[PDB]
Design a protein around this ligand. Structure first.
Ligand SMILES: CC(C)(C)n1ncc(Cl)c(Cl)c1=O
Lengths: 336, 324
C-alpha cells in the first residue's frame, strides 16, 4: 500500500509543495521515510527520486527540507528527460546544473553533493551548466573544485560545448581557469573547430587570445576550412588575419568560402561567390604559377570545367547560372 | 561638340521626362537624330541606348514617343544592370520584360519587337518574366508568339526557372506545352527536380496532374527524390505515393531523410533524424560501411538503433556518407 504514498510524495516533491510534502513525511517510521524518498518513479521516460525531481524543477524549498530535516542522500541517481533526449546516471546536482537552478545547485553543493559526479556518458554537472550557459553556476561549480578536464564519452570538453553553444561569457571564464584549448575529441575537433563552424566570432577571438593550436579534425579540415565550408565569412577573415599554411591553405579557404556562397541555400549570395573565388585566383598569380588541379567534366555540374585563368573567371562574372555550377565544381575539388 | 548633346538626350531618356527630351530632339536634321539616338553611353557599369534605358526604368511615357513617333529599331542592343549582375545582349523588349514593366512590354511588342530575341545567355523575355515571376507579362508574351521552348544556355527552360523560383502560378499556366523538359540537359535535372530541390510542394503536385504530364521520374544522379537530401519531407512523402517505382516494387526507396536532418544546420532536427531513419530498419525488416576514425553507427540490425545519445548525429552522418 506504500507504493502509492511514494507517488504522492514524488508529486509533492516535483510540484514544490513543501507543506504537502512535509505533511506526508511526518508520522512515519525511519524504515518508511527512507523508502518514500529512495523510491524511483517512472514518469514517462523520466525515472527519478523526490530529491532529484525537485532539483530538476528548481523547487529549492523541497530541496532544503529533504537535505536538512530528512538528511536525504545526494548520491541518488536517476534517468532524467532534458529536451527530448533522456540522460542517464544523473544526480540532483546534475539536473539542477542543466536546468540553471542556481540556488538548488548551491543547496546541493553546500550540503555536500559531488560536483564531479559523472553521468553514464561522463557528463559532469559542470558540463550541463556549460551547455546551458549559466556563468554564475559555472563559476560556483569550479570554485567548489568541479573539474574542467572531465570530458564526454567522446572527449567533448566543457570548453568545446560552450564554444559550440555560443556562450562567450563561460568560454572566456573557462579559459581564465586555464582550460586546455587544444584538447581534441573523437571527432578530432577543437573548441576552435566548433566555434568556427558555428560562427561565434567572439569565442573564436577568445580562443585566439589564448593561443589555440590550429589542428585538423578527422576529415582534414582546419578551423578555417570548417568555417569556410560553413559559410561563416566573418570567422574566415579573422582566422586568416593570423596563421595558416599560407598561399595553399589560404587560397583553398577563400575558394571554399566562395563555393559555399552558392551551395548553402540559407546565405546563398553569388556576388559573394565571385568575390572570394576571384580573390583566390588573384592570389594564385603572384609568382606568375599556382597549380589549378582541375578535374574532368561530369554529367552532373553540366559539362563545364572549373576556371584556371583569371580571364576564364572574369568571363562568368555576369553569368549567374555558370557561377552557381562553378561553386559546386569548386566544392567538389576541395572536398570530393 | 555633338557627343555632349548625346549625353543630355540620354539623361532625359533615362529619367523618363519625355517633355524634356523633345526640347533637345526637335529642330534637328536626320544626320544628327540618327547619332543622338544610337549613341552608347557608359553610366557606371551599364552601357546602353536611350530606347533601352527608358524601357529598363519603365518610363512608358518616353517609350511611347521613341517607339511610336519614329519607329526606332527594337534590335538595338545594350548591357543593362539588373540589381546584382550585369546582363549583356539585352534589348528594350528584354529589359522591360525583366523589370516587370507591363505597360512598356505591351508597347514594345505591339510596335514590332523581336518577341523571342535571346540575350547573350539566350535568355528570352519569356525567361525573364518566369524568372521574376510576373504571370501578367508571362501570359501576354505567350499569345504574342514568344516561343516557350526556347530556353537559355545549359538548356534551362522557362518552366525550369519558374519551377525553381516557386512561381506556381506561371507553372500551371506554362503547361500549355512541354512538361518533363530538356532534362536540364547540362545539370541532368527535370523541371520537377528543381521543384523537389526547393520543396515547392505546390507545383510538384502540378507536375503530375492538374496540367502537367506524368513527367519522367528518371534522373540518375539522385532520382527526382532529391528532396530527401534537400530535407523537403513534404514532397518526399508526396513522391512516395506514386508506387511500383518509388514504393510497392521499389524496395530501394529508402530515401532516409533523417541523415539530412542531422547535417543541414538550418533545418537540423536530430529527433526527425531517428524518426525517418528508424523507418528504414522497420521497412528493411518487413519480410554497410567501415568505421572511419571510429564510426559504424549505420547498421539497422544492430539493436535497431539504441537512440537517445547525440551519437546519432555522427550516425546520421555515416548514413549520408554511405548513400553518397
Ligand atoms: C562541417 C564539417 C562537417 C566539415 N565539420 N564542421 C565542424 C567540425 Cl568541428 C568538424 Cl570536425 C567538421 O567536420
Amino acid at each position: 500500500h506504500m507504493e502509492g504514498l511514494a507517488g504522492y510524495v514524488y508529486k509533492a516533491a516535483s510540484e514544490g509543495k513543501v507543506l504537502t510534502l512535509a505533511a506526508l513525511l511526518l508520522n512515519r517510521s525511519e524504515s518508511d521515510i527512507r523508502y518514500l524518498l529512495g523510491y524511483v518513479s517512472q514518469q514517462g521516460g523520466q525515472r527519478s527520486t523526490p530529491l532529484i525531481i525537485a532539483a530538476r524543477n528548481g523547487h529549492a524549498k523541497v530541496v532544503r527540507l529533504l537535505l536538512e530535516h530528512y538528511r536525504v542522500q545526494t548520491q541518488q541517481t536517476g534517468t532524467v528527460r532534458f529536451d527530448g533526449y533522456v540522460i542517464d546516471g544523473a544526480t540532483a546536482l546534475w539536473c539542477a546544473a542543466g536546468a540553471g537552478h542556481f540556488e538548488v545547485v548551491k543547496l546541493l553543493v553546500s550540503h555536500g553533493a559531488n560536483v564531479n559526479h559523472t553521468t553514464v556518458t561522463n557528463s559532469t554537472p559542470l558540463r550541463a551548466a556549460c551547455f546551458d550557459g549559466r556563468l554564475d553556476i559555472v563559476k560556483y561549480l569550479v570554485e567548489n573544485n568541479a573539474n574542467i578536464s572531465i570530458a564526454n564519452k567522446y572527449d567533448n570538453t566543457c570548453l568545446m560545448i560552450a564554444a559550440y553553444k555560443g556562450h562567450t561569457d563561460v568560454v572566456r571564464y573557462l579559459l581564465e581557469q586555464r582550460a586546455d584549448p587544444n584538447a581534441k575529441a573523437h571527432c578530432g575537433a577543437t573548441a576552435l573547430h566548433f566555434a568556427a563552424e558555428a560562427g561565434h566570432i567572439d569565442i573564436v577571438k577568445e580562443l585566439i587570445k589564448w593561443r589555440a593550436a590550429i589542428v585538423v579534425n578527422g576529415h582534414g579540415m582546419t578551423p578555417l576550412k570548417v568555417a569556410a565550408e560553413s559559410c561563416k565569412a566573418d570567422v574566415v577573415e579573422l582566422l586568416l588575419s593570423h596563421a595558416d599554411c599560407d598561399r595553399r591553405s589560404r587560397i583553398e579557404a577563400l575558394e571554399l568560402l566562395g563555393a559555399s556562397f552558392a551551395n548553402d541555400r540559407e546565405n546563398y549570395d553569388i556576388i559573394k561567390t565571385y568575390h572570394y573565388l576571384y580573390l583566390a585566383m588573384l592570389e594564385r598569380f603572384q609568382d606568375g604559377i599556382l597549380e589549378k588541379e582541375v578535374l574532368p567534366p561530369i554529367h552532373a555540374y553540366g559539362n563545364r570545367t572549373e576556371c584556371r585563368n583569371p580571364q576564364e573567371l572574369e568571363s562568368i562574372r555576369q553569368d549567374r547560372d555558370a557561377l552557381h555550377m562553378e561553386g559546386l565544381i569548386v566544392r567538389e575539388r576541395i572536398l570530393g
